[PDB]
Amino acid sequence: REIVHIQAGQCGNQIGAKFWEVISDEHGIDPTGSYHGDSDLQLERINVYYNEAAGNKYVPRAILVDLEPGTMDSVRSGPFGQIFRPDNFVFGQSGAGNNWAKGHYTEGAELVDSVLDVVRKESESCDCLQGFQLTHSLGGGTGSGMGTLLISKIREEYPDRIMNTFSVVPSPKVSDTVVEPYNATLSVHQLVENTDETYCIDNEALYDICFRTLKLTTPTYGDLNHLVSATMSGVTTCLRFPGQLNADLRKLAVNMVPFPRLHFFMPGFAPLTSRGSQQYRALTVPELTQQMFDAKNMMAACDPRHGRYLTVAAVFRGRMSMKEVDEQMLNVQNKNSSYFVEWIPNNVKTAVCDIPPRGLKMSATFIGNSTAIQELFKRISEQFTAMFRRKAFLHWYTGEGMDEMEFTEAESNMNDLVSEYQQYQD
Amino acid sequence: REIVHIQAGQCGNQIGAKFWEVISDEHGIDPTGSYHGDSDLQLERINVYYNEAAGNKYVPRAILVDLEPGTMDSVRSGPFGQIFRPDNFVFGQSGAGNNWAKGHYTEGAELVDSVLDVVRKESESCDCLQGFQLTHSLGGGTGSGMGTLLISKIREEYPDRIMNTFSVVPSPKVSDTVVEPYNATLSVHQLVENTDETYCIDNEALYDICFRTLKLTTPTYGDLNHLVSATMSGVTTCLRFPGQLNADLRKLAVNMVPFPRLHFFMPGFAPLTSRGSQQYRALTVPELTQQMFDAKNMMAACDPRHGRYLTVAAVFRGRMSMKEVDEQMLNVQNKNSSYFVEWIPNNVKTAVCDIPPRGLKMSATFIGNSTAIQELFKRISEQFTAMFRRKAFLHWYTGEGMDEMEFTEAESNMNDLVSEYQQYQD
Amino acid sequence: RECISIHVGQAGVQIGNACWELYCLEHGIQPDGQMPFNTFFSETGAGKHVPRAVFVDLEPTVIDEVRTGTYRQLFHPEQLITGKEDAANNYARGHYTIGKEIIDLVLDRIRKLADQCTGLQGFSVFHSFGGGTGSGFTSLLMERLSVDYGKKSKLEFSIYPAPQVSTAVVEPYNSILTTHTTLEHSDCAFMVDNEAIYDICRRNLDIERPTYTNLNRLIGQIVSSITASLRFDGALNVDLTEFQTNLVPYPRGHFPLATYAPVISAEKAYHEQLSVAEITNACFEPANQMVKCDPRHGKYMACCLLYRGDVVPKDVNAAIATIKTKRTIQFVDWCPTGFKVGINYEPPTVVPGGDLAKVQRAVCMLSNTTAIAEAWARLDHKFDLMYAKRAFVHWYVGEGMEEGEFSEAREDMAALEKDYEEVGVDS
Amino acid sequence: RECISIHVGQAGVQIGNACWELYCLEHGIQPDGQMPFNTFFSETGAGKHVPRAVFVDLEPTVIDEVRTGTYRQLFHPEQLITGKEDAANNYARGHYTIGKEIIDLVLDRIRKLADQCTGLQGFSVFHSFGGGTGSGFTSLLMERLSVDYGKKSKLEFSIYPAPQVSTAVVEPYNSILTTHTTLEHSDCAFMVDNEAIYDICRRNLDIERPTYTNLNRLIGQIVSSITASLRFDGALNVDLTEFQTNLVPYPRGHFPLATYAPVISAEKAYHEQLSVAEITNACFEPANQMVKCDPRHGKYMACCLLYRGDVVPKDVNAAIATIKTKRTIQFVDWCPTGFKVGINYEPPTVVPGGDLAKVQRAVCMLSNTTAIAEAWARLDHKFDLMYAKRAFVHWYVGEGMEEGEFSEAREDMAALEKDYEEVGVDS
Ligand SMILES: CC(=O)O[C@H]1C(=O)[C@@]2(C)[C@H]([C@H](OC(=O)c3ccccc3)[C@]3(O)C[C@H](OC(=O)[C@H](O)[C@@H](NC(=O)c4ccccc4)c4ccccc4)C(C)=C1C3(C)C)[C@]1(OC(C)=O)CO[C@@H]1C[C@@H]2O
Ligand SMILES: CC(=O)O[C@H]1C(=O)[C@@]2(C)[C@H]([C@H](OC(=O)c3ccccc3)[C@]3(O)C[C@H](OC(=O)[C@H](O)[C@@H](NC(=O)c4ccccc4)c4ccccc4)C(C)=C1C3(C)C)[C@]1(OC(C)=O)CO[C@@H]1C[C@@H]2O
Ligand SMILES: Nc1nc2c(ncn2[C@@H]2O[C@H](COP(=O)(O)OP(=O)(O)OP(=O)(O)O)[C@@H](O)[C@H]2O)c(=O)[nH]1
Ligand SMILES: Nc1nc2c(ncn2[C@@H]2O[C@H](COP(=O)(O)OP(=O)(O)OP(=O)(O)O)[C@@H](O)[C@H]2O)c(=O)[nH]1
Ligand SMILES: Nc1nc2c(ncn2[C@@H]2O[C@H](COP(=O)(O)OP(=O)(O)O)[C@@H](O)[C@H]2O)c(=O)[nH]1
Ligand SMILES: Nc1nc2c(ncn2[C@@H]2O[C@H](COP(=O)(O)OP(=O)(O)O)[C@@H](O)[C@H]2O)c(=O)[nH]1
Ligand SMILES: [Mg+2]
Ligand SMILES: [Mg+2]
């Protein structure tokens, strides 16, 4: 089958650029689009993410959306300017400038069709479309505006396909805009209703991980995006080669969403260690699960141990004993029975793929549906409230035709989300 | 069999010059008229468009008509001055100057016999005359005047042969004359009655295509004419070599005209892509049909999706699966059942020739009988009306002996044409 | 495709000097006619091609300047027609007593040229309204020429009695008397205001002290773009009668304004970066009108844009679309469109010893408008005033010019004004 | 992504000189425009790229300095708009009798630039409050420009009538009259105190004798970091409207303070070791405010920090966290946060013949605060006092400036002051 990858906004584009680096490397694809890998399984499911153009040129099944020419230019000027197809570069009038209404409601709305036409072109090149993956920020304006804008449009076209997104969440201590709550609140309002699964990633959390575990002196965005891309791959890596237990976006959703609306997930990645500490690694399934269930290795800022686990997905990579894995899963649930939600018998869904990440002997990725995430929503809601009570910055959206009712409705609906997570926590 | 190609006016001459470049290249003919092609099939039907003169000099079965010496000079001074026969260069007194009456009614009428004599000479060199192709503009004056003038005369001689024409239609936003409606209206009035098939091409539409798809920085007339020539070839290319399904001007007419009078067609051409984007092409039948049924790739300005398809011809070039083609045709009619006219069971006529355009692996050309084209006639009629209500510029035709009655009669008859297309649209 | 040029009084001749200098520059033709084009120069077997022109002045003075100055070897001596006594700013004398004494010769010289000329398209007359040798004589000649060549195009390039300033005080009379002949016999007339040009020289060429030399060069440059341009073989060779086809909607209204939008100083030639849209936009700005008229207070009937040198049709079309988008300038409501385009491949002509700096492309605009009609009202007032007092009337009566002719001339001018009013209002 | 710069009186021009010198230095552009950027310089085929700028002075003097000095070859002659008689420190004359005589030309030149400009973001106006040619004329122009381009961003960089010392005695009047236009039509205004700068030159650059040359260079350097910085493609390319998105919470409050925290002498460049936190900390010290204002007596509404050269986001975030930890400076209680970050990759600009020593990184701060509002009270007192005596009133009445206009101007200023009071108090 095939999956469409859409990138929206500078943040999403930079993450996606790193993502396509990673998986192109994974599948033996060079900077011309030519295949020079050593395995045959790299071509077994290459169709998932690549069109096979004449001459065996493999072309990212991806759409590049932005409203700020220049970022798009940096993409074309980068190593994958020879990889991405030119008619997938969609941009026009200047960007929203952190104005969600410009991104979703007005200026971005004008260019929707120029995206959807490409969506259709991509769809009709597929043998079986499984779903969509959106990569964007949750506060940027364009990425968050065009994000939910396109999500709505795409679902209208493909209501029965899987809507997946990787969203960068407003972090307590890592900012760059004072309307981050306005944009996030307006975005999530439409996100929930039109999304099947969404991942919440905090730059702050990554900033912590990239030092606490990776000991990076100068953690750059390219390193934080790199962490993200690793988990992005893991989510769908099971679809691209053989394994003892298969997995899927649908399979995950079936085992990760117990209550329709609660489809917000925390992502994590196994072996996190600095290059000087790698020599002390055991590389065992035990070791991996110690990291996977370590709160400090979660890429959401909220620490899971303030909430409970509605359900967990543990996707493993490489040769390993199925019993060994099962044993560790049991040990974990026995260890922290107070953390796992008792309403679920087996709180952990597992999967095991036969191929580790090139260069690793054995890896894994972690997807958690915890109730703790409600606290991130609370924090943002409070920031939103404080500003909204004074109608701060409201005229930036008023001038685009946005009323107060939307903002109060969104917040009311945000409260419902938190309330639901609290409903299912003791 | 053989087909006569007549060019009328600068526009028609420039298009034709490019046309003869194209098909001479197609059939391995150099700038002396000598054959140096690599295939044998290039000589299998070379008689269609060339006389075989002593020494194997292949001479365009074509008549060059103009009333403005100088354009004819540029033809003789061009690469095909060694190709075209000197007695096929028909010109005399200066041109109409955008005066249809001068082109058709008076000054041009004086020189009709000098053309028809050449027509007869060409006819008697043939083994079997199939029909005529006229290349001209629909507003130029001479090309549009001499055009319908000669069409009438030729049909009187050959009432049972096929009258085909490629007419450049007055474009909404691309002008160069303020009596474009007068000339067009007077022309089409006689065109319909005496024509078996006509193609409507807008310079504006080509201006859009040549940038939107070909990304040309400086689209010149030589590039727009080039687009036209590609489709001109496609119309008759089936007659000049082997194919899985043959086709013909008669065959097309039989499957393209359901109602005698409605023989106006929109032309299109498959693989339209810039030289930097060609590397991303799949070159599949699916891909080709996506382009062929793309409204944006239609060389008429009117967007087909505002009307319906009475009937479509899809002529393909090169080796391909017959099933594959049939599948795509089915998919298209299923996709847009609202666009196709339900009164027809199979709305698409297909043909497949064994030889792609030299340099292409696989191509195609599109001929659409849509009801949408009525809107072009409406627009022109409105412009005509606005001027005619004030008898604007009328004295230019009055001085040639043209009365008001002709103009009112023409418009009345133009309304009938539109009305008929509307009759057969929901 | 050939044509014949005609020059009268002093102004027509001086303008002609600039024109024929340009044509020489364009074709590389030397001052003795030697070439080291046949529509302006009769082919000579020795290589000394000679101008298809008739020069008339009832007082040889300006012609003597030609006869003794440069290009005395260029022009044929038979063409240099002169009188003995001048008309002296008297239309009636130029029309009758004085002009009629040479008009026979003039027509004979024209006939010779026309007999030599194969594909004669038409004529190009250079005259004023001020002098009688220009105004009155032209009136006589145009009538005679019209009779002989009813099928040939007659262009008249006239120097419009400027509204602000003039040099003779009896101009109104000579101007109004001319009007009813030009409107009757001409196929297309142009009206140029010296003062508007001087203003252009000040603003665009940055000239504090402008004179007839430079002024005429600009006018001639326009004519080159109108005519000679076509004869160099461009993308769109719009015929002279094709101009008329599209520019003229009625039997009358033969008054297009001819502008030139690459007017530029040598300094500006370095800093300024021109292109198709920039130049095209400039020609619709009420500054380079070449006449005391502000288009923004009338409507556009028709507009032919002539391009030279490095242009492409795409940009031209885009510029026009922008203009129609602008919508600041108004167009006649019953004229769907009014834009026509001519395009050359040959660059703009450069005058060694001129000012108009060399550019890679050029635009001329030939526009019919209702705004220009207002200029005649100003002349009407000047005429009416002097007429009311019958000032200087005895100079025309002394010829025998019927007083009623002046009243008739006015009525014909007034009719013309009325027609333009109706064009703008009606829909 | 392109913009247009505007310069008025003498001050706007002199500041402009520094700005365009910097831009040339940044892009390697020579004094004749030659490059051996398109958002400041119109692309020229010869390589001689020309500044997108309009220069206005009702007494050509300072423009003549430009016309005769260096960069006379850089700027286009059409851009150098001058009058004959100056406004002479009279807002009313600059607003009306004198300024209105050239405003038509000014707008026409702007239109040309705007027609050339594709993706116009907005304008950058350099003016004062002292002179009428700056104050009054700008008021006129901004109104006109606002009408034509209601959708384009209008930045105003003004030289604030300093509280301690000034050079004209009728400044209060011109200042207060300007206020109700800027507050009405501008999208974002900056206020700079010469005296605060001179003080900065003394303390940081160690200059005992500072003048407009060096003073202007500092101001220009700030503008480069605000604007040009974005056009070099950094990590965080904060748009000009994105600035407004985050800096401005209301329909008003368009008064950010622009500081530069790498101000340093050549000697200090050797001993001082700067970095992200050090420089960032310096910009929140009531010393480099660029205006007679002490932030510690008000609250921070919003604060955009723009970084250049060798910086990383980690250190920037850490520095900000430290600032919020410090808690000495107060922030608006209903503004959760107020920090926004822009980051370049291109280093700071160095002026050959300057003082501001070369550094590896730089920080600019664009901050909205309630503290600055206190500065207007000082102006109010100056105005009220002179107004009470109607001192010099006859110079404005002589123009026709309605006395009531002065009272209205004050009320609008007072409204602005009131708004800032409410911002700080309310929660
Ligand atoms: C000599 C050797 O064994 O080097 C290792 C290495 O030292 C370590 C430290 C790697 C290293 O990763 C990082 O330092 C890192 C840098 C920025 C952000 C995140 C991580 C490594 O760079 C990363 C690299 O990862 C891979 O090759 C995977 O296939 C990985 N690939 C990428 O992320 C990638 C990087 C650049 C270009 C293209 C792809 C991957 C993971 C999941 C899904 C798909 C691909 C590995 C094993 C190493 C180096 C090279 C030092 C580690 O990371 C990963 C993702 O494996 C960091 O902790 C682990 C443990 C590894 O042992
Ligand atoms: C290296 C290579 O493969 O080059 C291609 C190429 O790059 C592309 C872009 C060609 C190119 O066509 C154009 O760029 C073009 C220019 C003006 C107007 C219209 C088109 C090409 O020039 C055109 C040329 O077409 C042919 O050879 C056909 O036989 C075509 N011939 C002509 O039009 C022709 C041109 C010059 C002189 C004589 C004939 C043809 C098509 C239908 C019927 C008869 C003949 C081809 C494949 C190419 C080039 C050479 C780059 C494309 O066009 C055609 C008609 O094939 C444009 O989109 C297609 C896709 C092609 O891949
Ligand atoms: N544009 C232009 N106008 C001129 C020139 N010379 C004269 N004029 C105008 O022409 C007017 C008189 O026209 P002419 O017919 O040439 O005068 P003339 O040649 O002396 O003829 P008479 O006056 O009748 O003897 C003057 O008032 C000027 O305004 C010139 O070189 N260029
Ligand atoms: N920062 C800075 N301020 C200046 C400079 N030059 C003048 N000023 C200030 O500007 C005030 C007057 O502003 P301008 O509008 O330029 O005065 P002007 O140019 O003579 O215009 P008029 O006075 O109206 O004729 C002076 O009082 C100075 O305080 C300068 O170069 N830099
Ligand atoms: N994870 C990650 N987040 C980023 C990166 N760059 C920016 N962001 C976040 O995304 C937000 C801006 O989103 P952006 O793509 O610029 O939206 P836009 O400005 O409307 O186009 C910022 O507030 C950052 O927190 C990056 O490289 N990685
Ligand atoms: N497609 C195309 N159309 C043209 C070209 N040149 C002119 N035309 C169109 O044809 C019209 C003029 O026709 P023309 O051949 O000159 O007729 P004539 O002037 O009477 O000889 C113009 O209005 C143009 O729209 C060309 O090269 N290609
Ligand atoms: Mg005289
Ligand atoms: Mg001054």
Which residue CA neighbors atom 11 of ligand 6 most closely? B140
Domain shared by D163 and D242, yes or no: yes
φ, ψ (nearest 5 deg) of residue B391: 50, 40
Q: Is the dihedral of CA C418, C419, C420, C424 positive or negative?
A: positive
* Separation CA C85–CA C66 (nearest Å): 18
> A259-372 belongs to which homologous superfamily?
Tubulin/FtsZ, C-terminal domain (3.30.1330.20)
Domain shared by C339 and C383, yes or no: no
Annotate chain B with three-state secondary structure. Answer: CEEEEEEEHHHHHHHHHHHHHHHHHHCCECCCCCECCCCCHHHCCHHHCEEEECCCEEEECEEEECCCCCHHHHHHHCCCCCCCCHHHEECCCCCCCCCHHHHHHCCCHHHHHHHHHHHHHHHCCCCCEEEEEEEEECCCCHHHHHHHHHHHHHHHHCCCCEEEEEEEECECCECCCCCHHHHHHHHHHHHHHCCCEEEEEEHHHHHHHHHHCCCCCCCCHHHHHHHHHHHHHHHHHCCCCCEEECCCHHHHHHHHCCCCCCCEEEEEECCCCCCCCHHHCCCCHHHHHHHHCCHHHECCCCCHHHCCEEEEEEEEECCCCHHHHHHHHHHHHHHCCCCECCCCCCCEEEEEECCCCCCCCCEEEEEEEECCCHHHHHHHHHHHHHHHCCCCCCHHHHCCCCCHHHHHHHHHHHHHHHHHHHHCCC
A-interface mutation test, from D1, D3, D241, most A Cβ less than 10 A away: D241
Burial B20-34 (b: 16+ CB within 10 A, else e): bbbbbebbbbeeebe
From chain A, the residues in CB contact with D340 under 8 A are: 175-178
Tokens of D412: 């609008």
* β C339-343/D50-51 pair status: unpaired
> What is the signed CA dihedral for D326, D332, D336, D339, rounded to 10 degrees?
-60
Residue at which a domain ends, from D225, D241, D256: D256
Residues 6+ apart with CB under 8 A from B12: B134, B135, B136, B137, B140, B143, B147, B168
- Report the neighbours of D using a cutoff of 3 or more CB pairs below 8 angstroms: A, C
φ, ψ (nearest 5 deg) of residue B366: -120, 130
Q: Exposed/middle/buried for B323, CB within 10 Å: 0-12, 13-18, 19+? A: exposed
Of 3.20.20.10, 3.90.1640.10, 1.10.287.600, 3.40.50.10540, the CATH number of B373-426 is 1.10.287.600
**Closest in D239, D251, D302 to A95, CB measured:** D239
* Separation CA A113–CA B296 (nearest Å): 14
- C334 CA to centre of own chain: 28
Nearest Cα residue in chain A from B332: A124
From chain D, the residues in CB contact with C271 under 8 A are: 33, 44, 48, 50, 75-77
Domain shared by D203 and D275, yes or no: no
Which H or E run includes C257?
strand C256-260
Q: Is the dihedral of CA A223, A224, A226, A230 positive or negative?
A: positive
* Separation CA D94–CA D247 (nearest Å): 32
* Separation CA A166–CA A200 (nearest Å): 7
CATH number of the structural domain spanning residue D417 = 1.10.287.600
* β C153-159/C120-128 pair status: parallel
Residue at which a domain ends, from C222, C256, C290: C256
Which residue CA neighbors atom 40 of ligand 2 most closely? B357
Ligand 5 pocket residues where CB is under 6 Å:
A 9-11, 14-15, 68, 95-96, 98, 103, 137, 139-143, 168, 176-177, 203, 221, 224-225
C-alpha closest to that of B3 among B121, B120, B116, B130: B130
Residues 6+ apart with CB under 8 A from B136: B7, B8, B9, B11, B12, B143, B144, B146, B147, B165, B166, B167, B168
* Separation CA C145–CA B18 (nearest Å): 45
Quote the strand ranges of A124-196, DSSP E. Answer: 129-137, 162-169
Residues 6+ apart with CB under 8 A from A242: A41, A44, A353, A354, A355
* Separation CA D122–CA D120 (nearest Å): 6
A-interface mutation test, from B215, B275, B279, B361, most A Cβ less than 10 A away: B279
CB A31 within 8 A of CB A83: yes
* D35 has a chain A CB within 8 A of its CB: no
* Widest distance between CA atoms in chain C: 61
If you search the block for the tokens 């606290």, which residue do you land on? Answer: A375
Domain shared by C311 and C407, yes or no: no
- Which ligand gives the minimal distance to the CA of B318? 2
C-alpha closest to that of A316 among A370, A246, A368: A246
Domain shared by D248 and D296, yes or no: no
Domain shared by D162 and D297, yes or no: no
* Separation CA B402–CA B190 (nearest Å): 15
- Topology of the domain covering A1-258: Rossmann fold (3.40.50)
Domain ranges in chain B are 1-258, 259-372, 373-426
Q: What was the elucidation method?
A: cryo-EM
Percentage helix, strand, coil, to 5, in chain C?
45, 20, 35
State the helix-helix crossing angle for C171-185 and C374-388, rounded to 10 degrees: 130
Tokens of B251: 């065959």
* B357 has a chain C CB within 8 A of its CB: no
Nearest Cα residue in chain D from A222: D235
CA C252 vs CA A63, C70, C142, C331, D393: distances in Å = 61, 40, 17, 18, 62
C-alpha closest to that of C58 among C79, C17, C88: C88
**Closest in A175, A219, A392 to D249, CB measured:** A392
State the helix-helix crossing angle for B142-157 and B112-123, rounded to 10 degrees: 50
> What is the signed CA dihedral for D109, D112, D116, D117, rounded to 10 degrees?
60
Domain shared by C364 and C418, yes or no: no
* Separation CA B289–CA B357 (nearest Å): 17
* C391 has a chain B CB within 8 A of its CB: no
Helical residues (DSSP H) of C263-400, grouped into ranges: 268-271, 276-282, 313-326, 374-388, 394-397
Ligand 6 pocket residues where CB is under 6 Å:
B 9-11, 14-15, 68, 95-96, 98, 103, 137, 139-143, 168, 176-177, 203, 221, 224-225
Annotate A214-241 with three-state secondary structure. Answer: CCCCCCCHHHHHHHHHHHHHHHHHCCCC
From chain B, the residues in CB contact with C424 under 8 A are: none
Residue at which a domain ends, from D351, D371, D391: D371
Tokens of D375: 């500065």
Q: Exposed/middle/buried for D129, CB within 10 Å: 0-12, 13-18, 19+? A: buried
Q: Are A121 and B290 within 8 A, CB to CB? A: yes
**Closest in D119, D249, D312 to A393, CB measured:** D249
Q: Do chains A and D touch (3 or more CB pairs under 8 A)?
A: yes
Helix (H, G, I), strand (E, B) or coil at C402: coil
* C121 has a chain B CB within 8 A of its CB: yes
CA D295 vs CA D125, D205, D375: distances in Å = 26, 22, 12
φ, ψ (nearest 5 deg) of residue D333: -65, -30
Helical residues (DSSP H) of C248-290, grouped into ranges: 268-271, 276-282
* Separation CA D427–CA D420 (nearest Å): 13
Active site residue C242: yes
- What's the structural domain count of chain D? 3
**Closest in C272, C277, C281 to D76, CB measured:** C272
CATH number of the structural domain spanning residue C285 = 3.30.1330.20
From chain D, the residues in CB contact with C277 under 8 A are: 115
Q: Is the dihedral of CA D22, D27, D32, D36 positive or negative?
A: positive
| A340, HSE (Cβ side, Cα atoms, 13 Å) | 21
φ, ψ (nearest 5 deg) of residue B184: -65, -45
* Separation CA B72–CA B84 (nearest Å): 11
Helical residues (DSSP H) of C275-369, grouped into ranges: 276-282, 313-326
Domain shared by D183 and D286, yes or no: no
| Binding residue ranges of D | 9-11, 14, 59, 87, 128, 131-134, 167, 171, 194, 212, 216, 240
Domain shared by C248 and C278, yes or no: no
Return the ligand 6 atom nearest residue B171 CA.
25
CB A180 within 8 A of CB A168: no
Burial B249-284 (b: 16+ CB within 10 A, else e): bebbbebbbeeeebbbbbbbbbbbbeeeeebbbebe
Residues in chain A: 426
Q: Are A125 and B279 within 8 A, CB to CB? A: no
Residues of D marked as catalytic: 242
Domain shared by D16 and D151, yes or no: yes
Span from the CA of A269 to the centroid of ligand 5 (angstroms): 22
Strand partners of residue C82? C57
C-alpha closest to that of A41 among A316, A237, A319: A237
DSSP code of residue A102: I
Structural domain that includes position C347: 257-371
CB D263 within 8 A of CB D206: no
Which H or E run includes A212?
helix A203-212
Which residue CA neighbors atom 43 of ligand 2 most closely? B230
B51 Rama sector, left if φ>0, alpha if ψ -120 to 50, beta otherwise: beta
CB A171 within 8 A of CB A301: yes
C-alpha closest to that of C418 among C368, C373, C372: C373
* D77 has a chain C CB within 8 A of its CB: yes
Which residue CA neighbors atom 27 of ligand 6 most closely? B221
Q: Are C271 and D42 within 8 A, CB to CB? A: no
Distance from CA of C337 to the nearest CA of B (A): 6
Of C242, C346, C405, C417, the active-site residue reads: C242
Domain shared by D98 and D175, yes or no: yes
Domain shared by C297 and C423, yes or no: no
Which residue CA neighbors atom 7 of ligand 5 most closely? A11
CA angle B302, B305, B311 (to 5 degrees): 90
Annotate chain D with three-state secondary structure. Answer: CEEEEEEECCHHHHHHHHHHHHHHHHHCCCCCCECCCCCCEECCCCCECEECEEEEECCCHHHHHHHHCCCCCCCCHHHEEECCCCCCCCHHHHHCCCHHHCHHHHHHHHHHHHHHCCCEEEEEEEEECCCHHHHHHHHHHHHHHHHHCCCCEEEEEEECCCCCCCCCCCHHHHHHHHHHHHHHHCCEEEEECHHHHHHHHHHCCCCCCCCHHHHHHHHHHHHHHHCHHHHHCCCECCCHHHHHHHHCCCCCCCCEEEEECCCCCCCHHHHCCCCHHHHHHHCCCCCCCCCCCCHHHCEEEEEEEEEEECCCHHHHHHHHHHHHHHCCCEECCCCCCCEEEEECCCCCCCCCCCCCCCCCEEEEEEEEECHHHHHHHHHHHHHHHHHHCCCCCHHHHCCCCCHHHHHHHHHHHHHHHHHHHHHHHCC
Q: Are D239 and A174 within 8 A, CB to CB? A: no
